[PDB]
Write a protein that binds this DNA or RNA. Structure first.
Lengths: 112, 86, 87
DNA sequence: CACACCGGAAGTCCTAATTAGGCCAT
DNA sequence: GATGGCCTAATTAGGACTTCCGGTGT
């Protein structure tokens, strides 16, 4: 009954002192930073049996969120992203083609 | 159980005129559909052409690629091809 | 419940979410193309398929007798015209 | 030169939709 | 021949990320 999703992961790993050396906040609007990336993703991989995970990878996941509007990137602030809107996000007829004016069947012979 | 349900088959020429022609049919319907959905689902140009052993040439083509099969030009290009020796 | 919503029923209409769309075009482009194969293979018929991504590229499949459709000069020419025709 | 980032493409994973083989009818 | 359909069992995708990276910026 997992259903684990990155952004969420970074709210279990971003609400526990344990990994305050790799992942920590910044500001209070939700912003944060990945001090020790490779390990954060090291944690990630364990989760979702991805033993070959890493930042060059985990990064991309985040990068999509950019457009999926869940986490953007702060110009400069290396290793510093932020959750778009915080703290709100806390919560705690088969033949259709034949009749499409695109289809067309016939015969080779009829091609004169 | 009544019917064996979809049976797995060697992905190689079906050597049974009956089974083959029947397959070519069913699969021709699906792939056509697919083309139609691919194009309508993603507004992308798409052109499929399928020639039956019996000689029936079936074809799907989006607006911009229609000239591929309705133009006298391409119409003849298809002729040229499907008539080349085995 | 499960670890993922599994496959979700989609609306048979153009998708606006550029990502969702680009994705589906990938997954689907991968498959129809697989289909073009198995059919032509299983039945031994000539088959030609051609998909053009809204980004520009033109993925395609063809059986021997049809290669020219996309190989020959008369063909490639026609394909360009078509794809370049006004919207 | 290094290193984060950017993104395109296409490929897992899990599931829940969709196809497609045997067979009989049209 | 070419399909329609049933009964089931194979294959596809949708979503949500993963994998390869070749370009940038700084």
């Amino acid at each position: 009954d997992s259903a684990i999703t990155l952004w969420q992961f970074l709210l279990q790993l971003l609400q526990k002192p344990q990994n305050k050396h790799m992942i920590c906040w910044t500001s209070n609007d939700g912003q944060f930073k990945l001090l020790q990336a490779e390990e954060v993703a090291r944690l990630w991989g364990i989760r979702k049996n991805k033993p070959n995970m890493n930042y060059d990878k985990l990064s991309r996941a985040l990068r999509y969120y950019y457009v999926k509007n869940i986490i953007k990137k702060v110009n400069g602030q290396k290793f510093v992203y932020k959750f778009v809107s915080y703290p709100e996000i806390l919560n705690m007829s088969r033949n259709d083609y034949i009749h499409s004016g695109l289809y067309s069947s016939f015969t080779l012979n009829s091609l004169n | 159980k009544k019917t064996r349900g979809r049976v797995k088959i060697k992905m190689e020429f079906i050597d049974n005129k009956l089974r083959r022609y029947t397959t070519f049919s069913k699969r021709k319907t699906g792939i056509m559909k697919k083309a139609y959905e691919l194009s309508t689902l993603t507004g992308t140009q798409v052109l499929l052409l399928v020639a039956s052993e019996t000689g029936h040439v079936y074809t799907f083509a989006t607006r911009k690629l229609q000239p591929m099969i309705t133009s006298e030009t391409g119409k003849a290009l298809i002729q040229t091809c499907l008539n080349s020796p085995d």
